[model samples]
Target: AHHHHHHMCNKIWNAANFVIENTDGQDTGVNGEPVELSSVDRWIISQLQRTEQEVTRQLDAFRFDLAAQALYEFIWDEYCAWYLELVKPVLWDENAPIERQRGTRRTLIRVLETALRLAHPFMPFITEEIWQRIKGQAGKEGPTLMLQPWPVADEGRIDAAAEGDIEWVKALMLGVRQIRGEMNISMAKRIDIILKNASPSDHRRLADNEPLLMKLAKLESIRVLEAGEEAPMSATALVGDMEVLVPMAGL
Candidate 1:
């Protein structure tokens, strides 16, 4: 099924424009004093590499429909919905180090540019127009987005650990959202969530990503109960053998 989805062109511009609004005044390049990549940054980079590989392979296989689908999923789900949302905490932290902020801009620029290049063949005019604006800030090569080489998957950037970690976090968020829907809980109020029987890796994930989980999930607090500990009578769901519990006491 050779096909193209027209709304992806809209997503390309929306994502591009959002990046520009956040970074219009500064130049972002990979060649600075090494922007310390955050876990979220690493995850998006890994996902971008995955998308590039799939797109490249699909195109070569003459599976243009598959290629379009790959680009659509990457651009809409990974980049627009997740990466941009997850990175906001880093980008908006007024107290963060300048290098950290700059690092995010660099990643944002690099990923968005590559995505535009990856997607150019599908919607040349839309991608080229947005790429023109981004080029001024990011200094991406290519006198024209059209003339630029197709973005290649940088295999070394793919981090399975980061992907595993992030995917679990996403699952927890989804689980909590399901709890909210079932309980008639709204997104406005922060709620406490507990995880029971978490593995060691789950503990580490909680420690590492708690801030993001809190903000993104609107959680008042998150606690991981050790084994042999009793869980509160609570509304529950499961994420990777870990029980996600949102106590209904105060709700």
Candidate 2:
């Protein structure tokens, strides 16, 4: 148990360092920067605000465990696993538009800065040290994170549209992943998918997110069902109200 705990601690520490390395750089601050937010960016910002509100409420109620759990899930699941991976292509692609890259960088840095502040009450020393480095990167002169005001949630910035769009993307990816997992499909094997019984709104959402869905789900192609079209005999999964069909012909 001791060795396992130590290993987990090392993994957590490495994750924190990874965030610092990616975000602690020039061009992190959004102040006066031309920022063009993508769906993912807006979704993450809304999530961060919601997290800030929840954590603050928990702390105010003296519920340390609840606060810790909330931040833990947000940092590990949302920020690290999803947000970073989604933005990597934009961040690394030299041909990618400069405004998009700037938006991601700004979001990454600002979110981390706010998150560190929310986490500081629990882990003061580590949070303060990291925040100081990030402060320099963001070109801000501040007293210190310790003395800074607690992060306040901005209800007006809550973006339900962005949230709904990303949630649909996540659902599609998860549905594809579930099919692959249950059927023992090779992780590297890309497949084609068809969406059946999709509403017009789903069609629009899918159109906007086709590239992301393909990249994340390792799909060769995706097509929506035509009116009265019959679904091919296939493995199937449900993403919310939509049905994901993977034809068995290739398998």
Candidate 3:
């Protein structure tokens, strides 16, 4: 059984806070900003979050069974292998969109802080390296992320609609990815997908998510069909219990 989201949220924040409270250093960072130190703190916090998530998943499975394997594969193979790697260069490189660059930098900083906090108990040396860099830059203390206060999610800043929106997009993308994998398709190849007899809600959602779908699915074109199959040699997959056909004519 899954813990309530809020309960887990509280646990996560508590763990994050613990990392910061424990890791405050002696030497401050550059320009007296403490930006570097704060960055490390956040990164360490994120790592701790990942560790907890892994533990909970293992507990839920109770063994290295299919459920456990699925979780592991999804988290590591899919999320880390594909998603993180794909996004990293864009985020880390300085030439990306100004807005995206800012967001990506913030995420990286947060993750580093979380990681330092989590690893403080085990790998003190590595944590110190990252922590010192952040602290030195920010012109803060010499202490590490472990000494910093834990992070808490600001409830007022939480966007419930964003959660649902992202989850829905994730489901759609995963389905598309599964279809591509099963069909032995290459990411280099482009496809045309037709939404056949899609319900009103799905139609609206897909329309709203067209850009994301195209970006993830490598779609050259997308067509809406009231009924019938358009591509004779196409592979299909279901999203939200509805069939979606990917035409392979161009590829």
In terms of TM-score, the best-performing candidate is: 1
Count backbone clashes in candidate 1.
0
lDDT of each: 0.84, 0.79, 0.49
Best prediction by lDDT: 1
Candidate 2 per-residue lDDT, tens place, 1-251, comes to: 11232343343456557666666544665466577889899999999999998998898899987887787677767887788778776776777677877787888877777877877777777777777877655545697888888888899879999999888888888888889998899878999999998988899898888877777678999999878887789999887788999999888
Off by over 4 Å in 2: 1-12, 20-26, 29-31
**If both were scored by lDDT, which would come out higher, candidate 1 or candidate 2?**
1
Model 1 earns a TM-score of: 0.93
Q: How big is the positional error of residue 133 in model 3, measured in Å on the Cα after superposition?
A: 3.6
Model 3 Cα lDDT, one tens digit per residue, 1-251: 33333443343344334323322432122222223212212332333354446644654567434333333343333333343433344444546554444443334434445444443444455555656655433334635566765433344434444444445556666776787888888876777777666777677666666755676667887777745535456677776666677766655
Off by over 4 Å in 3: 1-97, 134-142, 197-209, 226-233
Pairs with steric clashes in candidate 2 = none
TM-score quality measure for candidate 3: 0.55
Task: Compute the lDDT of residue 69 as modeled in candidate 1.
Answer: 91
- Of 2 and 3, the candidate ranking higher by lDDT: 2
> For model 2, how big is the CA root-mean-square deviation?
3.2
In angstroms, how far off is 225's CA in candidate 2?
1.7
Candidate 3, position 169, lDDT: 57
